[PDB]
Design a protein around this nucleic acid. Structure first.
Ligand SMILES: Nc1ncnc2c1ncn2[C@@H]1O[C@H](COP(=O)(O)OP(=O)(O)OP(=O)(O)O)[C@@H](O)[C@H]1O
Ligand SMILES: Nc1ncnc2c1ncn2[C@@H]1O[C@H](COP(=O)(O)OP(=O)(O)OP(=O)(O)O)[C@@H](O)[C@H]1O
Ligand SMILES: Nc1ncnc2c1ncn2[C@@H]1O[C@H](COP(=O)(O)OP(=O)(O)OP(=O)(O)O)[C@@H](O)[C@H]1O
Ligand SMILES: Nc1ncnc2c1ncn2[C@@H]1O[C@H](COP(=O)(O)OP(=O)(O)OP(=O)(O)O)[C@@H](O)[C@H]1O
Ligand SMILES: [Mg+2]
Ligand SMILES: [Mg+2]
Ligand SMILES: [Mg+2]
Ligand SMILES: [Mg+2]
Lengths: 264, 264, 264, 264
DNA sequence: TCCCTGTTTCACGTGGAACACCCT
DNA sequence: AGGGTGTTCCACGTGAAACAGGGA
């Protein structure tokens, strides 16, 4: 049995990668698939959105990579039966020392997350990883551990040069440490369809990348997460948008996204 | 003559650090004060916002920190006569390794920017530093070099946790590397007043922090940068907002911010 | 022992004359003051609102106006010991002929209600008159027999022309038939404050009339009867709203109205 | 051509008779049929809804019945080309004496409006007559003039007793003065489908009257005018709803009403 | 059987942003 | 095209009313 490993990644800050990672893991779990969410960010917002406050987590993801803990020891069960979580902390910031000290000897350490994952790749249908807003060692680990990658795009000017940067980082990993990697899709998020900027940013991206954007395969239309404040309120209750408000615009787009993952 | 050096910092991604750093440095410079803007981010969104392209620039700030260049060589003149820019590149992400090699040697290297800025500080009234989304080495450098620090707040749930721990980084360095360091002010960003998440997030923030919020000395009112899509448009035109739409509310709010900073 | 006779009048249909007349008379009678309620409408909705079937009572007010009955025989004891009712039939539309044969004859016909009320005026603290939607004879009698007049205002467009029109009827009789007659107050009815029609109608009304709007003497605030569907439900059960839902906002507002009338 | 003459009638005040009569006459005129709106009420709200002022109306509907003018003199043209209006004044209140002065001799005068309509029944497809809130001479005249009768029903407790009375008045006239009179339909107005009262009132009415309610001939569903404050704002601009807001719910139901009339 | 308190559900005002004139 | 205007569209807060347990 094999888990599909998905990275949610962008180096631009505040683009919905944590909201995607939490609400994609949720929307997949309600289809009765076995889901593991890795909060791979030092800010650890994905953990906080599931209602586990940072201070009361005993041992975390940082302890796994060093070899201090097994990954199954740190796995927590969430509110949903088919959702499980590997949390994060401020302690994850110290991974960057551990990475670069390992680089100057064996040049591995991009793979520290893959080898951590190895034990649990057969208990899950899906393992979703939430990355920080940078192209450093945390993100690089996640891209190296992943079968595929979901890219949230806030359609605003810096996405343009930013996306081509992220894909270029993706190309050089395919050709080195992770050939098995694929672009799972591009996910327009915080989407406000009528803005001129949103139109104009989409048009430049569709120009190069259109085949790569998520289709609802049923109706052919694009899957885009609308700007909805209930998506934003939802982590204050420690719940994904499913449990919080299931009929809202955002939850709908997150369910539709789950189906397009499941069709292939 | 000593520059006041103001780092614009928040570790949460996408809260308007770059938009604020670009616009304040512009709004300060129309008063005929000499301003240097430092793009301290590998994403290099500040350099993009002033109409440069990072593929086409010769030497960046990474070449200054490694000592290869003196900082007055990499300085570019912008479209404004009082605004100069130390640009940045993806190559600034290479500073990551170098920090933990300088931590390994001197137990310093947080002061690299501080020692780089020493040649140009009698040359400008204000130096504005745009920090990346982390508590990692670059932001610590931006903070350890600075007299004061602006904290842009997008008024949403992750800010409650996130501001708190940024302050503790500030209190750490206020006891350690940079005891002179001041909090310049709290700057509400992307502000939509009528929203119950925005109200409640600002409510929780006001009981702890109210004295640290930027105010308009004429009216006594809070200075808050409104959500205006024009603020997002101007970097596509390679411009600060005052050269784009000077009458727009975002331009008005950044110039109010500028005036309250110039007062001391 | 002299009754204050309050005509509840507006020529506009459906503005809450009957609801106001029925509910004020109940709210005055729980203060243990004796109230006579006069259904001066052929539609006879007031009689229906107290739970008396139109076809099941012997003689009505029409029979007093034509002299066939002394009014004290036509009086009925309601479910409240302090509320009595002069009921009405469809027969009261038969006053219409009889009026235009009275000024023909004696130049009276204005005063028949005034003279019918002569036997019972020393017998009640308050007498409440519920008038039909016209400036014709029945409203005229109702207005000419009254010490004071309540004007219910549905705050909507026709009220502007409608209220101004009624006042000229009022000041005509103040100049002629009944000079002692005073406006008791304006009573906003079916009130929904948030509506811009309601704000605009009330505003145009306030510049001419504000002094004559009913106020709560304790808080200084206006007395307005809200839209509450409990008020509309109450006559189906044959009750005033204090016998239906005494806790509802519409009940509170009529009791405030009652309190304001009792005090002066 | 013989005009179909339609009375909008009910003796309950403020149930939407004028709003029905103006907006039905309007919704018929956009179908390129020739429409004459007789404002037959003393309060004259139909006229005021079309942006005509009482102070500037020269000779009115009162003058036609007294023989002071022929009807084609007093007819005015509205904003719409296919909508003509016969206006009213405060002077129409003096019709009531003329009726019972003709009753004292020859027992006619119920037919005074019909006889006045003789010259214009061939110049119009539709003549919409708006009656006052009573069963006296003005309503009777127009009920005797009309081919059919539309009953607006505000679904609230007094509709029950009021309707039985208005149907019974129709039976008296079907027997005597106007045998050709049909009930054109029942039109629920100010409709709020959620309320317990509204349900409860309709259920007692459907019990006796169901086939008499207006159906959409297309869908089969009932046609009811919804409570919309745009319907209320609309006369303040001197416009029927279809010029004011043609999109709004109120205008839609009034259009569907016009369609059902147009199929006979 | 009388009560209480959450959730749904629906009309209506609010303000941002696009856009179509319209100025001249 | 530059600078008004107002008009149209869309999210989101607001509060009334029904309803569903949950109260023993
Ligand atoms: N469609 C949406 N509508 C409204 N708010 C959203 C939406 N998606 C995400 N958010 C909110 O926007 C903010 C940024 O989203 P999020 O934090 O998931 O982005 P991020 O890329 O994870 O940020 P970081 O760069 O710190 O990792 C959060 O406050 C979140 O609550
Ligand atoms: N009213 C506003 N104020 C600030 N930024 C805005 C506003 N409206 C839109 N934006 C846009 O919001 C986006 C995020 O802002 P910005 O990139 O300045 O945040 P940041 O803190 O620099 O993010 P990063 O962590 O990626 O550096 C940008 O695309 C900017 O163009
Ligand atoms: N404050 C209120 N809120 C809700 N419904 C009300 C209110 N006041 C009255 N009603 C209802 O509104 C309708 C009109 O009220 P009412 O019959 O008292 O007006 P009116 O002035 O007596 O009209 P008319 O005498 O011309 O028929 C009735 O159905 C009544 O049940
Ligand atoms: N949804 C609606 N449908 C009909 N009328 C409405 C609606 N909303 C508000 N109104 C208003 O209802 C009020 C009474 O309606 P209207 O005046 O047409 O009834 P009416 O029977 O003509 O009254 P009158 O008894 O004075 O003749 C008016 O102020 C009208 O503007
Ligand atoms: Mg995140
Ligand atoms: Mg930035
Ligand atoms: Mg009445
Ligand atoms: Mg009317």
């Amino acid at each position: 049995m094999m888990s599909e490993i998905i990275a949610v990644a962008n180096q631009k800050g505040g683009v919905g990668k944590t909201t995607t990672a939490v609400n994609l893991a949720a929307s997949l779990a309600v289809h009765e698939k076995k889901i593991l969410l890795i909060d791979f960010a030092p800010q650890a917002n994905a953990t906080s959105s599931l209602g586990f406050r940072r201070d009361k987590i005993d041992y975390d993801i940082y302890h796994v990579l060093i070899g201090r803990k097994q990954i199954s020891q740190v796995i927590l069960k969430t509110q949903m039966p088919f959702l499980d979580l590997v949390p994060s902390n401020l302690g994850l910031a110290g991974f960057e020392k551990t990475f670069y000290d390992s680089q100057d000897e064996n040049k591995r350490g991009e793979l520290m997350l893959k080898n951590a994952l190895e034990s649990v790749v057969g208990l899950y249908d899906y393992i979703i990883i939430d990355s920080p807003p940078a192209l450093g060692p945390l993100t690089i680990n996640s891209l190296s551990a992943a079968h595929s990658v979901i890219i949230p795009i806030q359609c605003e000017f810096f996405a343009l040069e930013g996306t081509k940067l992220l894909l270029n980082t993706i190309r050089m990993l395919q050709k080195s440490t992770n050939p098995k990697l694929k672009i799972r899709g591009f996910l327009p998020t915080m989407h406000v369809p009528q803005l001129n900027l949103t139109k104009g940013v989409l048009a430049e991206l569709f120009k190069y990348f259109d085949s790569e954007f998520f289709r609802d395969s049923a109706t052919g239309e694009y899957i885009m997460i609308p700007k909805s404040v209930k998506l934003a309120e939802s982590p204050s209750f420690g719940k994904p948008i499913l449990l919080y408000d299931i009929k809202s615009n955002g939850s709908i787009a997150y369910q539709k996204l789950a189906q397009s993952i499941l069709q292939g």
